[PDB]
Design a protein around this ligand. Structure first.
Ligand SMILES: CCc1cc(-c2[nH]nc(C)c2-c2ccc3c(c2)OCCO3)c(O)cc1O
Ligand SMILES: CCc1cc(-c2[nH]nc(C)c2-c2ccc3c(c2)OCCO3)c(O)cc1O
Lengths: 208, 208
């Protein structure tokens, strides 16, 4: 079973600006995703302080960067708090309607696209480099869900068959044809060091 | 009634490093506090999307910067989600034990003190400029509380008498004698523009 939803008008607009604006500094997508992972990891660490049982679905709090040159996907996995079905539908837990409006007004007054994360909508920077994004997520209070979108104004949500992840969020970037540099090991390392060097959780870059 | 608590050893250590390390770029305290306010504002905006009644304690989502040269205090107020008594006691809702350890290890490997916010413990950067910090907070699910500390290994929590704030968090910096520059209007504006220029919520700098 697959449900299909329209993005709110404001998120459709944000997505179109990211996809259609000429902007060469596309590499900032990664620190935005890493920063999202870090926030979700913070959240599970804090909840676990009063209820250790929240970590029964995995004690290790970390981030994995997984390139696959065959599928042309870059995957950012964390073992953070994950998301419920309702959070996913509700702009992946972001304040995207108000965040987008504030971001637009900022762009009018001298901001640029790399400041997107300052408005709580950094997730959508994914579309700087990816033609399609799949988000798989598992919250302690819910089943595993798969969100997906190639933009165009719509996204799907379904229950995720098979591969149970325990707890956390997985962002699979199906990369644009001309953005394959972000599957190269030295490129990913360079970007982590440039933008995400000092982070509260370990980051493992998988090799192929 | 006043309760007195010991900081966990790790937070006592973080606090001592901030107070005793020679580090001239003290002005970053403000963007860390503004960034905390922004996160709390994000949180109430998101909760309000499924339950509008969460905003009955105030619809306006903003940040106020209030200097007072007579009391020598700089106060950062927001109308964010606020904090419960347990959050306050639990390192003001931060992941400060793990955050501190990660921050220390980062400092050993080329980080500096301005990266403190990357470890979820930016609040304590307050002690770069303040001899005593008072935090007043009001969550929808609780009464108004006052947290306070002049470091030295301890903090107090009490119920807050009188001045009800509706909803949010108030950080009153009782500034060190030699740090009065942060009460000057042009100094505060300069710092907001340098470090907190593009933020998802309005910031009002009160005049005297
Ligand atoms: C789809 C975007 C995304 C979300 C998460 C994530 N998992 N669990 C949570 C609560 C989050 C999350 C949600 C919203 C958000 C986040 C993180 O960063 C702060 C403000 O916006 C994540 O871990 C990675 C990620 O790329
Ligand atoms: C005492 C530190 C502080 C806290 C808040 C605040 N109010 N409500 C909440 C949930 C928060 C908060 C708590 C922890 C935290 C915050 C924000 O920034 C992200 C991670 O660490 C705040 O609004 C301002 C502020 O200076």
């Amino acid at each position: 079973e697959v449900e299909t939803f329209a993005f709110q008008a404001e998120i459709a607009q944000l997505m179109s600006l990211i996809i259609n604006t000429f902007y060469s500094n596309k590499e900032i997508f990664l620190r935005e995703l890493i920063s999202n992972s870090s926030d979700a990891l913070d959240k599970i660490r804090y909840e676990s302080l009063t209820d250790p049982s929240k970590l029964d679905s995995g004690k290790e709090l970390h981030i994995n960067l997984i390139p696959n040159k065959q599928d042309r996907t870059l995957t950012i996995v964390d073992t953070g708090i994950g998301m419920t079905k309702a959070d996913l539908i509700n702009n992946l837990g972001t304040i995207a309607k108000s965040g987008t409006k504030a971001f637009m007004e900022a762009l009018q007054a001298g901001a640029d696209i790399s400041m997107i994360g300052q408005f709580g909508v950094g997730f959508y920077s994914a579309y700087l480099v990816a033609e399609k994004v799949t988000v798989i997520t598992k919250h302690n209070d819910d089943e595993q869900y798969a969100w997906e979108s190639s933009a165009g104004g719509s996204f799907t949500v379904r229950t995720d068959t098979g591969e149970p992840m325990g707890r956390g969020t997985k962002v699979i970037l199906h990369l644009k044809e001309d953005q394959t540099e972000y599957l190269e090991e030295r490129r990913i390392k360079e970007i982590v060091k440039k933008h995400s060097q000092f982070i509260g959780y370990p980051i493992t870059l998988f090799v192929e």
